[PDB]
UniProtKB/Swiss-Prot annotation:
One of its GO terms (molecular function) is RNA polymerase II CTD heptapeptide repeat phosphatase activity. One of its GO terms (biological process) is regulation of transcription by RNA polymerase II. Its main location: nucleus. This is Carboxy-terminal domain RNA polymerase II polypeptide A small phosphatase 1. The chain holds residues 77 to 256 of 261 of the full protein. Its EC number is 3.1.3.16. Stimulated by GTF2F1. Inhibited by beryllofluoride anions. The record marks T76, K114 as: Transition state stabilizer. Preferentially catalyzes the dephosphorylation of 'Ser-5' within the tandem 7 residue repeats in the C-terminal domain (CTD) of the largest RNA polymerase II subunit POLR2A. Negatively regulates RNA polymerase II transcription, possibly by controlling the transition from initiation/capping to processive transcript elongation. Recruited by REST to neuronal genes that contain RE-1 elements, leading to neuronal gene silencing in non-neuronal cells. It comes from Homo sapiens. The active site is at D20, D22.
Length: 180
């Protein structure tokens, strides 16, 4: 069985974009951060720890627009119990049509790989936005790299990628732009 159901009517003409959470859209820590965007309590072996979450600058604009341009899918190497609460707070617009977590990755040579082949979408119309090439070793021709983000409040990578996405949203075959 594929990782996604069939695309709903309003999504099936669109390109599918698989989006990484950590160091791509947000950055989370167990070290207390003053003036955090969100704090989520995560239970680990019966004990609750606070996870301090910072949003990358421009992520609201980015997410809002990507959910129009694309069938967006959150595909994180992290675990639902941290990633669901975070996505609930982040995704104000219903941008993420599905959420896929650690179990849905393939652990390959010490790396959590998003294997786009198990999605159930024609690979000519799938993109992956990820801060590490390890994320997409199987699909390097589907990828749009973005630098890892931690706390640099002057970052504008998400803002500056939007026009490129704006363009990719409209092609028929992403390989015609990325090359395969
Ligand atoms: Mg990441």
């Amino acid at each position: 069985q594929y990782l996604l159901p069939e695309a709903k009517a309003q999504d099936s003409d669109k390109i599918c974009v698989v989006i990484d959470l950590d160091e791509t859209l947000v950055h989370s820590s167990f070290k207390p951060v003053n003036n955090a965007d969100f704090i989520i309590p995560v239970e680990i072996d019966g004990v609750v720890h606070q996870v301090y979450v910072l949003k990358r600058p421009h992520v609201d604009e980015f997410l809002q627009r990507m959910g129009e341009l694309f069938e967006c899918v959150l595909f994180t190497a992290s675990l639902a119990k941290y990633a669901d609460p975070v996505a609930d707070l982040l995704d104000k617009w219903g941008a993420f049509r599905a959420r896929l977590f650690r179990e849905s990755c393939v652990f390959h040579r010490g790396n959590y790989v998003k294997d786009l082949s198990r999605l159930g979408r024609d690979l000519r119309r799938v993109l992956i936005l990820a801060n590490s090439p390890a994320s997409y070793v199987f699909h390097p021709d589907n990828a749009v790299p973005v630098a890892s983000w931690f706390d640099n409040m002057s970052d504008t990578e998400l803002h500056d990628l939007l026009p490129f996405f704006e363009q990719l949203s409209r092609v028929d075959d992403v390989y015609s732009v990325l090359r395969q």
